Symmetry: C11
Subunit: 184 residues, 11 copies
C-alpha cells in the first residue's frame, strides 16, 4: 500500500531528473510586501498540480500533524490572529518531509473570518514549505537569489487564457468506469 512500494530505477531517474531543473516564469507570482520590495512566491494550486504530476495523484500525501492557534489579540476592535501548522508530506516509498507554516490575519473585523484565513493560510504555506524540500522543481528555486535576479531580467508574459472546450460537463466517466471494471 502507501509508504511500502519501492520506486523502480527508471521511475527514480525520471523523477530525479525532472526535480533537478527549475521553474519557468509562469509559475512565480509577486506580492507587494508591507514596507518592502516585491516578494516572489508560487500559488498553492500550481504546486499542488506539480505534486500530482511529478509523483502521481496517488503517489504523494500530506497530513496536518499538529495545528495550534498562537494568538488571538483584540486591538481597538481589530483582530490580530497568528496560527502555526505542522504539515508532513509523504511519498509512496515512505520518504517524508515535515515543515511549519504560518497563517496571519490583521485587517478583518469578524473573528470567525480572521481564524478562517489564518488557519487556511497556515495549512497552505505548510504544504508549500513541506513540498519545497523535495527539489528545485517543486518550488525550491524561489529562495535562490541569483534565480530571482535572472527572473527579473525576463519579459513579463501575459497570463494564459484557458481553453475549456474540453472541460468536464457530464458526470458519467465511461473511460474511468470501464478501466475500473477491467481492474475488478
Amino acid at each position: 500500500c502507501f509508504g511500502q512500494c519501492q520506486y523502480t530505477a527508471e521511475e527514480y531517474q525520471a523523477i530525479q531528473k525532472a526535480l533537478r531543473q527549475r521553474l519557468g516564469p509562469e509559475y512565480i507570482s509577486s506580492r507587494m510586501a508591507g514596507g518592502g520590495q516585491k516578494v516572489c512566491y508560487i500559488e498553492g494550486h500550481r504546486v499542488i498540480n506539480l505534486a500530482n504530476e511529478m509523483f502521481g495523484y496517488n503517489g504523494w500525501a500530506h497530513s496536518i500533524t499538529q495545528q495550534n492557534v498562537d494568538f488571538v489579540d483584540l486591538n481597538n476592535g481589530k483582530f490580530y490572529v497568528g496560527v502555526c501548522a505542522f504539515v508532513r508530506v509523504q511519498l509512496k516509498d515512505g520518504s517524508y518531509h515535515e515543515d511549519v507554516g504560518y497563517g496571519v490575519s490583521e485587517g478583518l473585523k469578524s473573528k470567525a473570518l480572521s481564524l478562517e484565513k489564518a488557519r487556511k493560510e497556515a495549512v497552505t504555506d505548510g504544504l508549500k514549505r513541506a513540498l519545497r524540500s523535495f527539489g528545485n522543481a517543486l518550488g525550491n528555486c524561489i529562495l535562490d537569489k541569483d534565480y530571482l535576479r535572472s527572473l527579473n531580467k525576463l519579459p513579463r508574459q501575459l497570463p494564459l487564457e484557458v481553453d475549456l472546450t474540453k472541460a468536464k460537463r457530464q458526470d458519467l466517466e465511461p473511460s474511468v468506469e470501464e478501466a475500473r471494471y477491467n481492474s475488478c
Copy 2:
C-alpha cells in the same frame, strides 16, 4: 481491504487523465460576499458525486480527525459562532490529504441553530478543501484566476431540469440483491 489495494496501471492513467482537466460551467455557483465582488464556489453534493464517480463509491473515504469550537460570543443578543474542523480524505491505495474547514454563524438568534450551521459548514468545507488537493477535476480550478476570468466570459446557462421518470420508487433491488447472491 481499504488502504491496501494497489491501483492498476490502466486505472491509474484513467483517473490521472480524468483529474487533469478542469470543471465545466455547470458546477461553479456564485455568492455575494459581504462588501465584496462575486465569489465563485462549488456545491458540496457536486464534489461528493465527483468523488464517488472518480474514485468509486467504495474508493474514497473521509473522516473528521478533530473538531473544536473556536468561539461562541454573545453580542447584544446575537450569537457569533466560529468552528474549525480537520478533515482527512483517504483513497483505497493509502494516499490521503488532510485540510481544515471553517464554519461561521453570525445572524441566527438561537444558539443551537448557530452551532448546527457552524459545525455542518465546517465539515462541508473541510471535505471540499481536502478533496481539492487531488487534482483540478475535483475543484482545484476554482482558485485559478485565469480560469475564473475565462468563466466570466461564458454564457449564463439555465439550470437543468432533472428527468426523474426513472427515479427510485420501490425498495426491493432485484439487480443488487441478485449480484450480491452471486457474490456469496
Copy 3:
C-alpha cells in the same frame, strides 16, 4: 470479517449503478421551518432501510465516535438543549464516512425529555448526513436545488397503505433456523 472482504466486480457495478440514480417522490417528506419556507427531508427509517437494502443488512455499520452536550440553558423556565454527535458509517470493504449531526430542543419543560430528544435527534441526523456521502440514492439529492424544483412540480401522492397480512405473528423462524443449521 467486517472491513476486510473485497467487493466483487459485479457487486461493485450493481451498487454503483443503483447509487447513481435519485430518489422518488415517496421518500421525501416536508416540514414547516420556523420563519421559513417548506424544508424537504427524508425520514430516518427510510434511509435505514435503503442502507440495509443497498449494502445488505450485514454490509454496513455505524458508530458514535464522540457525542458531547454543547449547551443546556434555562431561560424563564424553558430548557434550550443543543447537542452534537459524530457518526461514522463503515462498509464491509473498509470504506467509511464520518459526519456531524445536531440535536435541538427548545419547547419541552422537563430537562430529561429535552436531552432525550436532543441526543436521539443528534444521532439520527448524524446517521443521515454520514450516509448521504455514499451517493444520490441514499439521500444526496435532497440538497440539489434543481431536483427539489422538479419535485415541487410533481403530483402529491397519497400515502401508501401497508398490506400486513403477511406480517410476523409467530416467533419461530423455520426457514432461518433451517438455513443456519445447514450453515453449521
Copy 4:
C-alpha cells in the same frame, strides 16, 4: 470466534428475507403519553427473543460502551433523574450498530430507586434503538407512520395464554449435556 465468522449465502439470504418484513399486531404495545396521544412501542423481551431467534443466541452481542448520569435534581422533595447510555450491538460477522438510550425518573421519592429505574431503562431503550437499525423485523416498523395507521385499523387481539405444561421443572439437561459430551 465472535466477530470473525463469515455468513454463508443461504444464511445471509434467510436472515435478510426474514428481516425484510414487518411485525405483527402481537408485538406492539401502547402507552398513554403525558399530554399526548397513544404512543406505540415494543416490549424489551420481545425484541430480545427476536434477536436470539433471528441471529441465534450466540450470534449477537450487546455492550454498554459508555453511560453517564446527565442530571439528578431535587425539586421540592422529588428526584428528577436523567441518564444517557451508549449501547453497541455486534453480530458474529463483525457488523455493529451503536445508539443512545435515555432513562427518565420523575415520580419516585427515593433516590436509589430513581437511579435504578433511570439506568435500567436507559440501557433497555439503548438496546432497542441499537437493534432497530438491523431491519424492519427487529422493530424498525414502529417508526413508520403508515404502518401505525394500518395497525390502528386492526382488531384488538386478546393476549395469549402461555401453555407451560412443558416448562423447565428439573435442572439436569440430558440432551444438552449429551450434545456437549459428543462435542468434547
Copy 5:
C-alpha cells in the same frame, strides 16, 4: 481457549432449544414491594446453576467491568447507599452481554454493612440482568406479563426437601483426580 472455541451444530441446537422454553414454578420467588403488589423474581443461585448447567461450568464467565458508588447519604443517623455495577457475561464462543445492576441499602445503621449489602446486591442483579439476555430459560420470562398471570393461576408448591445422603463429606476426589491423571 476461552472466547475462541466454535460451538458445534448439535450443541448449538441443544442449547438453543433448551433456552427457548420458560421456567417452572419452582424457580420464581416473591417479595413484598414497598407500597406495591407482589413482585416476582428469581434467586441468584438458581440462575447461577442454570448457567453452569446450560453452558457448562467452564462455558460461561462474568466480570465486573466497572462499579462506582452512586451516593452515600446520612439522614438523621441512617445510611442511604446506592451503588451501580456493570457486569459483562461472555460465552466460550466469544458472544457477550453487558448490563447494569443496582444495590440499595436504606435501613442499616452501620455504614460498612450498608456498603456491603449495596455492592453485593448490585453485582448479583447485574449478573441476573446480564444473563437474562441469553434467552427465556435463564430468566427472561420473569418480565412477561402473561407468563406471570399464568403463574398466579398455579398451585403453590411446597419447597422441596434436599436429600443430602450423597453430599460431599470427604475431600479426596478419586474420580476427578483419576480423570485429570488420564488427561495428563
Copy 6:
C-alpha cells in the same frame, strides 16, 4: 500455559459432576450476627482446599484486580474501617469469575490493626464470593434456604481430630525432586 489448555471430555464431566452436588455438614460453620440469628458460612481454608482439589493446585488462580479503602472514620477514639476488594478467579481453560468482597473493622483501637483486618477479610470474602460462582460444591449451597433448613435438622458432629503422624517433618522431598528430575 495457563488460560490456554483445553479441558478434556472425561475431565470436564468429572469436574462438572463433582461440582453438581452440595457440601456436607463438616464444611459449614456458624457465627452470631449482631442483632440477628445464626449466620452460616464456610471457612476460607476449606474453600481453598476445595479449589486445589477440584481444579488442581495448578488449575485455578486468583488475582486482586482492584482494592480501595472505602472509609476510615474516627469516632470517639474507635476506628471504623470499610474496604472493598475486586477478586478475579481464572481457570486453566480461560474461564473466569470476578466478584467483590468487603472487609469491616469496628472494635479495634489501633488503626494499623483495623486496616490489616479489613483488607485481609475483604480479600478472603472476595475469594469466597468469586469461587461461589463455579458450582454448588465450592460454596454456592450456603445461600440456599432449603439447604440450610435441612442442615439445621442434622446432628451436631464433633470436630475431627487431625492425625498428624505423617506430617511434614523433613525438608528434603525425595519423591518430588525425583519426579522433577525425570521431568527434566
Copy 7:
C-alpha cells in the same frame, strides 16, 4: 521460559500429593499477642525454603505489584506506621496467586527505622499469605483450628542444632561450573 512450561503428569502428582499434607511441629513458632493468647505462625525463611524445595528454586517467583504507605502518624513523639503491600506469586506453568500483607510499626522512635520495619514486614507477610493459597504444606494449616489444637497437645521439641561442617567456605563451585560448561 517462565510461565510457559507445562507440568508433567508425574511432577504434577508429586507436587499435589506433597502439598496435600500438613506441616510438622518444627515449622510453627509462637508469639505473645498484645492482650491475647499465643498466636502461632511460620517463619519467613521456612516458607521460602519450602517454596524452593516444592516448586524448585527456578519454579516459583514473587513480585510486589503495588505498595503504598497507608499512614504515618506522630503521637507524642512516637511513630505509628501502617503499610500495605500487594504480592503476586507465579509458578512456571503460569498459575498465580495475589494477596495483601500489612507492616506495622508502633514503638520505634526513628521514622526511618519505622518505615524500614513496616515495609519489610508488609512484603514478608504478603509473600506468606500469597504462598498460603497453594496448599496445606506451604502454610495453610496454620489457620485450621483443629490442627492448632492437635499441635498444642504435642511435646515441645528442642530447637535443632545446625551441623555446618559442610558449609560453604570456598567461593569456586567446581560442580556448578562444570555442569554449566556441559550445558554450554
Copy 8:
C-alpha cells in the same frame, strides 16, 4: 520501504567518498554579525539540494520531533521571540541524526511576523545542523577554522547567472508519466 533498504557496497563507497571532501567557494555566504566579524554560513536551499543529490530525493527525510516557543517578550513595543526546534534527519537505511535549531526575531513590530520568522528559521537551522553530522560535504567544513582561513585567501567569485532556457514551462511530463506507466 523507508528505513529498511540496505545500502550496497558500491553505493556506500560512492556516498562515503563524496561526503569525505569539502565544499567549494560558491556554497558559503557571509553575514555581518552584530558587534562581530564576518560570519560564514551556507544557504538552506544549497544544503537541501546537496541532500537530494547525495542521498537521492527519496533517500533522506526530515521531521520536526518537537518545537516549543521559548519566549515571547514585549519590550517598549517591540517583540523579542525565541523559538527552539528539534529536527531529526533519517536515511533510507535507518541511520538518523537529531539536532536543535533556534529561531530569533528582535526587530519586527507585528507579533505574527515575528513568530513566522522565528519558527521558520528555527526549522531551517535545525535542518542545517542535523544534516551537518553526515559529513564534510553537507556543511561540516563551515565550522573548521583552517578551512575558513583558506577560504578567506580565495578570490571573490561573481554570482553565477542561471541559464533557464530549459526551465519548466509545461505541466505535462511525458518522460515521468511514461516511466511510471512502465513501472505499473
Copy 9:
C-alpha cells in the same frame, strides 16, 4: 536471549544442590546496633560474587523498578533521610524475585552526602533482600536463629590476606579477545 533460555537438568541439579547448603564463617560480618546486641549481616560484594559464581556473570540481572525518597527532615541542623527502593532480580530462565530495601542517614550534615548514602544503601540492601529469596547459599541463613547460635560457638577466624601476585596489571586480554575472535 535473557529470560528465555531453559536450564538443563544437570545445571538445575548443580545449582539447586549448591543453593541448598549454608554459608561459612568467612561471609558473615557483624555490626553494633544502636541500643542492641551484635547484628550479623553479609557484605554486599560477597553476595554479588556469590551471584555471579552461582548463576554465572551473565545468568542473573537486577533492576531498580521504583525508588522514591520517603522523607528528608531537618532537625536542629542535622538531616534525617529515609529512602525506599524496589529491586527485582531475574535469572536467565525467566524466574524473578522482587524485594524492598531501605537506606537511612541520620548523622551527616551535608544533604547531598545524606541522600548519597541513603540511596546507595537502599539499593544495596534491596539487592541483598531480593537475592536472599533464591536459597540458603545466597544469604538466607543469616535469618535463621539456630544457625546464628551455632555461628557464635565458632572460633573467630582472622581475615584472609589477598594474594594479588596474579592481579590485572595489563589491559590487553589475549585469551578473552582470542575466544571472542573464535566466537565471531
Copy 10:
C-alpha cells in the same frame, strides 16, 4: 535495517583495533579556563568525522532523548542560562551509549542568543561525551592525565593548510548517481 545488522569478525577486529589507540596532537585543542590552567578538549567536527570514518557515515546515529532548560536567570541585565541535554548514540548493531551534556551562557545580553548558545553547546558536548564511551580513539584519552602530560611534552605543530583544489564545485555527482542506478 539500522540496529539489526550483525558486525562481521573482520570488521569487528578492524574497528576494535582502530579504537584501541589514542589520538594525535592535531586533534586536541586548548582553552583558557576561568581562574584555571589550560583545559584540553577536542573540536566537535573532529569527533564527528572520526565517527563517520570509524563506524561509517551510515553506521552510527545520535538522538536527543530529552532536553530541558535548567535555569534562565536575569542578573543586573545579563542572562545566565544553563541547559542540560541527554544524547544517545547508537551503532548499526544495536549497541548504544547515552550521556548528558551541559550548555552554559553567561556574557550575552540578548536572551535569544543566550539560549541558542546554551542549547547548541549542550547538544554538542552531549554528543562528545556519548561518543567518548566507545573507545580511546573517539576522544577518551582526553581524560587521561598521563596522556595529557605526554602531550604537553610535544612540539606545538602549526595548523595544516587545507588543499581545496579538489573541493565540491559542481552539484551533479556522476559517480554517486551511477552507483545508485546500478543499485536500483
Copy 11:
C-alpha cells in the same frame, strides 16, 4: 542484534575467568576525603576501557533510565547541588544491571557549572556502580577491605609515560574501510 545474541561456551569461560581476578595497583587512585582518611577509587576512563576490552566495544551498552535534580540550595552565595542518576548497563546477551550514582557540587559560585559538575559526576559514578556488579575485574575489589589493606602494603609505582609514536594522526583508516568493504 543487541540483547539477542547468545554467548558461546569458550567466550563465556574466557569472560568469566577474566572477571574472576582482581585489579592491579595501576588502576586504583586515591582521594583525600573531607575529615577522613584516604579513599581509594577507580578512574572513569579506566573502567570504560575495561568494559570495552572485556565485553567488546560493541558488547556492552549503558543508558540513563532516569535522572532528577535532588536539590539546588543557595547558601550565602554558594550553590549546593545534589543530583541522582539511574544508570542501566546491558550486555549483548540481554543481561543487565541498574544502579544509582550521585553528583555533588558545593564550592562553585556559578549555578551552571555546579549543575554541570553534579550531573556529569552523577552519570559517571552511576556507570561505575552499575559496572561494578559484573565481577571483581571491573571494579568490585575496591570495596573489599582486605584487598585495600594488601594494596596499602604495595610499593607506590610511578605513573606510566604514554608512548604515542603510533597515535592517530591521519583521518583515513585504510584497514577499517577495507574490512567494511569486505563486509559489504
